[PDB]
Enzyme design. Structure first.
Site, short mmCIF file in Angstrom:
data_model
loop_
_atom_site.label_atom_id
_atom_site.label_comp_id
_atom_site.label_asym_id
_atom_site.label_seq_id
_atom_site.Cartn_x
_atom_site.Cartn_y
_atom_site.Cartn_z
N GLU A 55 -42.89 -33.63 22.98
CA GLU A 55 -44.17 -34.26 22.67
C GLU A 55 -45.37 -33.36 22.99
OE1 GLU A 55 -43.15 -37.91 24.97
OE2 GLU A 55 -43.17 -38.92 23.03
N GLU A 90 -36.18 -39.74 20.85
CA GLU A 90 -36.80 -40.82 21.62
C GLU A 90 -37.14 -42.01 20.73
OE1 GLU A 90 -40.28 -39.97 24.05
OE2 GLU A 90 -39.23 -38.40 25.16
#
Lengths: 449, 449, 449, 449
Positions: free
Chosen positions: C165, C354
Site C-alpha cells: 500500500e 488484502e
C-alpha cells in the site's frame, strides 16, 4: 395438503348456559344443582361458581358480535331450565324466556342458525329435592319443559338436542361424585341414565306431535379406547369404554334395547336399569342426528384387578402430548369414533357438537393470545373430520367447544377451552389467535395443512 | 404408567462409518461413492462432507466411554468397505482392519456386544467406476468383502447385518438421485435392489459355511402408511408403500420370490428385476432376524395422478407435530409395522436397529442440551415397543439412532439425531439430556410414563 | 449458486509485523516510525501502541496452529525492518532474523507457502531521523535491507512483495498526516512515492541478480471510484482516484513513466516527482505479479470546489451499508478494479493480497463470535473474485485481511478485522465464526451462496 | 451527503384495487380472475384472498387521511374493472363508480393528484370465461372499459396508466402459472402480451379523441440484469431479460415493432405474436410517459442448458442482502434501468410508479414498527433516483410501493410492503417509522444521507 369440506358444511361453535350466562340470581331464575354444588365448599376448585361467569346474560349483543365476527353458520347453546321454570315445573318465568328469545332473534337476524340444547346438566334444585333424575317424576318435568321450549322457540329453532353428554350427567355426577349432585352410587347412575333416556324419548315424541319442522337428537360423549393388544379380552375391554358412555344411550334409541354386552356386565355385578314396562318403546323413537362430542381417547387392556376398575379395562399411557387439562391428544380417535358410529347406527347424520382443547394461554405483552397449541389441535382434528367425510361418513357439521373461556365445572375458571379469552376479573373479552384461525377455515371451507 | 421390558432385552445405540469416523483420506482408505458425492458441488447442503465428521477414527476410547456411560448392552456400527478393501476387492488394507479390531476389543472389554453392519451405503468408488451395484461384478466383490470380515471379526462379533436400509441405497440413490451415486432411473434402482439381495444371500451362505456362531440379518427401513379411507384402493396404495421399501427385500429372503403385487405394479410400468436363473434361490437363505428401522409413517390414498406418484399413492398431511427434519410423529406406526412384520414373516426375531428424532437443540448457557422433544419422542416409541412385546411380537432389542450428532448425508451436519451433542467446529462432545434419560431407561429396564 | 475457484487457487490470510508481533523493545529491535508515532500523545486512539499487540513474536507455534487449522495454503506476513537492521543499515540483528527463520520453517513444515512483505510502513526511526523516505539515502538502505532478506530467507520464500500500500505510506502518512511520520506536505508525499518506487526497482533487480527462484511484486491499494454521472469530467475525476493511489506506482513499473493525466494534474498545482536521471529506468523492472488490496470504493463526481479536494473529485454517499470502521460495502468494485488492472497491465498475475471487513463483534455468552456480517462481506467479495476468474482475469489467489484482530494503526485496537478474536487484555485468541466459514470455503474450493 | 430533488418533483405512494379494497362481493361487484384464483385451494399461500384485505372500500376517509398525513402530492391507485362493469362489458355498476368518484373527490379536496391505473390484473371472470386476454374479444371489452372511465373520471384525473406490469399479467400468469389465471403456455403468454398492447393502443387513441387533458402511459416492470462476464453472449443474455419484460411492450408503442432480438429468439423456439394486420399501427400510439417499476436486478450469464432457462440467461447470486421476500438489493439497478430507458426511448417523461421493499416488521412493545431496513432500502434507491436526475434523465416523480401492507398476491398477507402496518385480524392501521421518514423526505425535497 388440502383438506376439503362440503359447501353445505355447518361450521359452528358451542357454549353452555351455566358456563357463560351468569346472573344466576336474577330475573327470577331458580337455583340448579350446579349453583348448589358450586356454592358447596370443596366441590369446585378455588370455590369458583357460575354466579357471574362471562355475564353473557347481560351481553347478548357482545356474544352475537363475536359470532358474526367468527363467521359461524351455526351456534349451539343451552337453555337454563331453572331460568324458564324456576321450580322445574309449573310457574313459567317469562323474564328467562325473554332472554332466549332476544338471543335467538339476534342470531337469526345475523344469519346464524340456532342449535338449542335443552339439558346441559343444570337441573332445577327443586326437582333435585324430590330425588332429581333418580325419580321418575323428573321425567314428567322434562317432558313439560321440552314442550314449553318447543312451543316458545320451536318456530325459530330447527336444531334441537335433548341431553348433552348423558354419561357425564349420569355417571360422573351420580357414580364418581365429581359433578353435581355429587353422588357415588353405580345403580343410581344407571337409574338416572334410564330416566333421562325416557325423558328424551318423550321429548322426541312431543317434537313430532307438535309438527315443528327441524331436527332433534342427542349428544353423547362416547369415550374411545384403542386395544393395547390384539386380544379378544382387550377389544372387549375397549368396547365397554364406548359402551357405557355412548352405546348405552344410543342403542335404546336406535334399536329399542340396551347394549347386550353392557347389560350382562352390569347384571353380573348386580345392576340393572329400572325398566318399567313400556319404557324401551318410549325411548325407541327415531332421531334426526347424533351429536358427537370428542376430545380424546385412550389405549386400554383387560384387567380384572383394581387397575381395570368397574369395567375391568385399564388405560395405559401412550406418552402422547397432553392439553393443559391433562388429556392426551389422539386425533385419530375422532375418525375411529365417527367410523364406529356410522357403521353401527346406519350412517345417520352426524354433527361434531363439541371438540376443542384446554390451553391456558393468556395475553402476551403483545396484547394478543398466541395459542398455537389450540390451532394445532383443532387443525389435526379437522383433518380427521375431513377424512371421515372423504370416507363416506355423513358428517354434516363441526362445532368447536367453547366460543369463549368459561366456568369449567369442577375445574372452576382455571381451565380455558375458548377461542375468545375472558379475563374473569375484568370480564374483558379478547379474541385469541385460534379465533382468527378458525374464522379463516370457516371462510375458505378447506384447510391447507 | 409402567411400560415393562424383558430382562434380556438388548438395549443399544447405533452409528454409521461415513457419518462419524472421519479420516477419509488416512491409513490407505479408499474413496467411497459418498466421498465423491459429498465432494461434488451442490450435492450436499452447504458443501459438507464426512472428511472429519466426529473424528471417531481417532477417538475409539472416547466412543467406548460414551457407550459405557450410557450403559448400553449392544452397539451397532458399520464397516467402511473402502477402509478394509480400498479397491473394493483385492489388496487388503490392514490399517483399516486394525481400527475395527481395536474398537471391537474395547467394546468386548467393557461388556458391550458388537452389532456389525457390513454395508451402510459407502460403496468403494473403484467398484462404482465399474458400474457399482448396477453390475453383477459388485455382487462378487461384496461376497469377498463379507467373507473377509467374517474371518477377521467373526470370532468377536455374533451380530451381523448385511445391508442397512436397502431402499435408501437403491431407490433414494439411483431413482430419486438424492443419495450417492445420485442417479434417476427406476430400472437401475430395481437392478441395484436385486443385486444387493443376491449379495446378501451369498453373504448369508458364507456366514453359515464358515460355521461362525451368531446371528445375521438385514435391516429394511420399511416405510409405513395408514389408509386415508377404508377403501380397497387406499389399502393397496398403502401396501405398495411398505411393499417397495420392505416387502420387496424381505419376501425374496423368506419366500424366495418378490412380492406379487409389486411385481405386477412394476411390470405394468415396464420394469422387472434382472433375475438370472438361480438368483432367487441364492437370496432365499434363512436369516436369524429382521432389523426394523422406524422413524415415521404417513396417511396415504390412491391417486392415479401426479400426486400419487409412481406408486399412485398420495400422502396426506395428518397435521401432526414434526421433528426438525420435517418428519411427522406417528409413534403408533412402530407397533403397526412390527405387528405387520410379525404376522407376515412368522414372528421372527426383531431388533429395532434404528429409531430416533432429529432435533437441532444446541447448548444452552446452562452448558447442557435440554432436548425434551427427543426424550418425548423416544418415550412414545418405547411405549409402542413395549406394547408390541406385550402383544406377543418377538422384539428382542432396541437401538436408538445416533449415539452422537453426525453427518446427516445430503442434509450435511445441520440435522442432529444424536444423544450426544457434537460441536463440529471444536469437535467437543456434550451428552444431551436425552443421553442421561435413555441411560436411566436402560438401567431400570422399564419406563414410568 | 455455485461460485467455483480453480484447483490451484492460492487461498491465504495476511498480517503485518507491527500490527501483531509485539516485543517492540526486545532482542535488540530498533524503534520504527510507528513506535514513535504510537508513543506520541494524540496520534493514536486511546494512546494505543504495538508494544504488545498480539504477542506473535512469542507465539510462533500458536500463529502457525491457527494457520493449519484454517487450512490456508499461503500466509502473507511482513518483516520488521528495525528488527533485522535496528539502524536501518549496518549492524545485523541476528535475533530478529532468527524469529523470521523460525516462523518460515514452521510454515514450510506444515505445507504453508510464505508470502513475504519486505516493507509494511515500519521504517526504522534511525533512517527517519535522516529524512526518512524524503531522502534518497533511504533508497540505498532499502536496497541493502532487501538484499539481506533475499539472501537470508530467499531459499525458503518464493513469494515477495516490496511495498504494501504505497499510497498509505506516502500520501496518508506525509500528505494527510494520519499515519507515521504524520506530515502534511503534498510534494513530500510525491517525493516519498518516487523514492519508494526507485527502492522497489532496485530490489527487483537484486532479486533477479541473486538468481533466487520465485515471484516478486508490489501491492497497491488502488482506490476505486464510480462515475456519479456519465460525464467526461466525472469519469476523469474517478480516474484520478485510482490514478493517484495505484496507477501512479504501477505505470512507472510497467511502462517506465508516471501516468500522464496525473503528472499534468500535479504539474498544474506546481508539483513534480523528484526524478533523477536514470530513476525511471531503475523503476521500470518487470515484476511477476500485482497485489490487489481491496476493501471499498466510492461514487465520485467532478468538483472544482473544496468538496472536490486536491483531485477535484467529490465522493457522494451511496447510502450503502457500512462496516464498523465506516467503509461502504461495494463488492462489485473488486471486479471493476481487477478488470481495470487486467486490461491496462496486460492481464498479469493478480493476487488479492488484502480483503476483509471491520466488524467489532466480540464473544457472546455462547463463548463464540457470531460475526455473520464478516461472513456475508467475504462471501460477496469472493463471488466477485470468482466472477473475475470466469471473466478471464488472471486472479491466482486470495488472502483475506487479518488472521486475527490486531493494532489497527491510528484506530488503535478498537477496530477488528480478523477471523480470530483477540482479547487484548488477556491476549486470548478465539476463532470467530468467519474463521470456520473461510476454512470450509478453502476446503471445498467453491462457494454455495 | 445531500441528494437534491426538483421543486416540482411528484412525490407519491401507490396501491392496487384487489390488494387493499376488500368488499369483493358487495355493491354488485363481479368476480375477477384473482377472486377465483385466490379462492382456489393451493393457489395462494395459507388460502388467503382479497375478500376483506384492508377494507379500503369502506375506509375512503382513513385512506385519504394517511395520504395527507404523509404529505404525498400524488396517489396512484387502480380501478377494479369488475366493480364498474361486473361482466367486463355492458351493464354499468354505478355503485362501483360512486366509490371511485368519492375517493377521487377526497383526493382533490386535499390537494392530492390522482394517478389512475386502469388495469392491475383484476380481469372480470366473465371475460376470462370467454378466453380472457387470449381472445381478441377482451381487447374490445377493455376499449369499452377505458372509454367509460375516461368519461367518468377523466375530468378529475389527469394521470392515466393503461396496464401495470404487463409481463406479470402475461408471462407470470399465463406462462409460469404463478398468477391468475395460472396457465403454463409460452405462446398464450405471448398472445396475451400482444392483445394487451392492442387494448392499450386503442385506449390511448380514445384518450386523445375524447380530448381529455392529462397524461397517459404504461408501467412496465422491466427486469434488470448485469453481465457476469464482459462477453457478447452475456450482454445479450442480459438484454433478453429486460427485453422480454419491458422492451417487448415499449418498442411496439415507441417504434411500432416488437424488439428484433426478442422476435428472433421466440421465432427460433417456434413462437410468434398473433399480429393481425393493422395491430402494430394501433399499438404505435404516442404516450406521455413511461412508468418504471423497480425493486431489484440480477447478474446473468449466457447458458444454453436448463440453468439458463427459456432465455438461456442464468442468474448468479451476488451474495447481496435480500428483502424478506428474498429479493437481492441492487440499488444501482434503478439508475441503470432509468439510464437505459432514457437512452433508447428518447429520454421521455419517467415516473417511478413502484419501488419498495418487503420487510415483515411488526409492532414492537414500543407500539411502533421500527422498520429501519425499509428506510435504508428506500434511501438507497432515492439516492439513485436523484443521481438519474443529476445525470439529465427526465425523472419527474417517485411513488413508493404500497401505502399500507396488503394482499401480496400468491404470497398472501405474509409479505409486507407498506409504509403503514395493517393488522389483518383487527384491520388496525399503524404508521411505521418508514412512513414518518418518507414524510420528512417529501417535506424537505432532499435527503441528507
Amino acid at each position: 395438503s388440502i383438506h376439503m369440506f362440503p359447501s353445505d358444511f355447518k361450521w359452528g361453535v358451542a357454549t353452555a348456559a351455566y358456563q357463560i350466562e351468569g346472573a344466576y340470581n336474577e330475573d327470577g331464575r331458580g337455583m340448579s344443582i350446579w349453583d348448589t354444588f358450586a356454592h358447596t365448599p370443596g366441590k369446585v376448585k378455588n370455590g369458583d361458581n357460575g354466579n357471574v361467569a362471562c355475564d353473557s346474560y347481560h351481553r347478548v349483543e357482545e356474544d352475537v358480535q363475536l359470532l358474526k365476527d367468527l363467521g359461524v353458520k351455526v351456534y349451539r347453546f343451552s337453555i337454563s331450565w331453572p331460568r324458564v321454570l324456576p321450580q322445574g315445573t309449573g310457574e313459567v318465568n317469562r323474564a328467562g324466556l325473554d332472554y332466549y328469545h332476544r338471543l335467538v332473534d339476534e342470531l337469526l337476524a345475523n344469519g346464524i342458525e340456532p342449535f338449542c340444547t335443552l339439558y346441559h346438566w343444570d337441573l332445577p334444585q327443586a326437582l333435585q329435592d324430590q330425588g332429581g333424575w333418580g325419580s321418575r317424576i323428573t321425567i314428567d318435568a322434562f317432558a313439560e319443559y321440552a314442550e314449553l321450549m318447543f312451543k316458545e322457540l320451536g318456530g325459530k329453532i330447527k336444531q334441537w338436542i335433548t341431553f348433552n353428554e348423558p354419561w357425564c350427567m349420569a355417571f360422573l355426577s351420580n357414580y364418581l361424585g365429581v359433578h353435581a349432585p355429587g353422588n357415588k352410587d353405580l345403580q343410581l347412575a344407571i337409574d338416572v341414565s334410564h330416566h333421562l333416556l325416557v325423558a328424551h324419548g318423550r321429548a322426541v315424541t312431543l317434537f313430532r306431535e307438535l309438527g315443528i319442522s327441524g331436527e332433534i337428537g342427542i349428544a353423547p360423549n362416547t369415550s374411545w379406547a384403542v386395544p393395547y393388544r390384539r386380544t379378544k379380552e382387550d377389544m372387549e375391554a375397549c368396547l365397554r369404554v364406548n359402551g357405557w358412555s355412548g352405546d348405552w344411550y344410543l342403542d335404546p334409541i336406535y334399536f329399542g334395547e340396551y347394549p347386550k354386552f353392557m347389560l350382562d356386565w352390569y347384571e353380573n355385578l348386580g345392576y340393572k336399569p329400572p325398566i318399567v314396562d313400556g319404557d324401551m318403546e318410549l325411548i325407541h323413537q327415531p332421531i334426526d342426528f347424533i351429536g358427537i362430542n370428542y376430545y380424546t381417547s385412550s389405549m386400554n387392556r383387560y384387567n380384572p384387578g383394581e387397575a381395570g376398575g368397574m369395567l375391568s379395562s385399564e388405560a395405559i399411557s401412550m406418552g402422547a402430548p397432553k392439553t393443559d387439562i391433562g388429556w392426551e391428544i389422539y386425533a385419530e380417535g375422532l375418525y375411529d369414533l365417527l367410523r364406529y358410529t356410522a357403521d353401527k347406527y346406519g350412517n345417520p347424520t352426524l354433527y361434531i357438537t363439541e371438540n376443542g382443547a384446554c390451553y391456558n394461554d393468556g395475553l402476551s405483552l403483545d396484547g394478543r393470545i398466541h395459542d398455537q397449541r389450540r390451532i394445532d389441535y383443532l387443525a389435526m382434528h379437522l383433518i380427521q373430520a375431513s377424512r371421515a367425510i372423504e370416507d363416506g361418513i355423513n358428517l354434516k357439521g363441526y362445532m368447536e367447544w367453547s366460543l369463549m373461556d368459561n366456568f369449567e365445572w369442577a375445574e372452576g375458571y382455571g381451565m380455558r377451552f375458548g377461542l375468545v379469552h375472558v379475563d374473569y376479573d375484568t370480564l374483558v373479552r379478547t379474541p385469541k389467535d385460534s379465533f382468527y384461525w378458525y374464522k379463516g377455515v370457516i371462510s375458505r371451507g378447506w384447510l391447507d395443512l
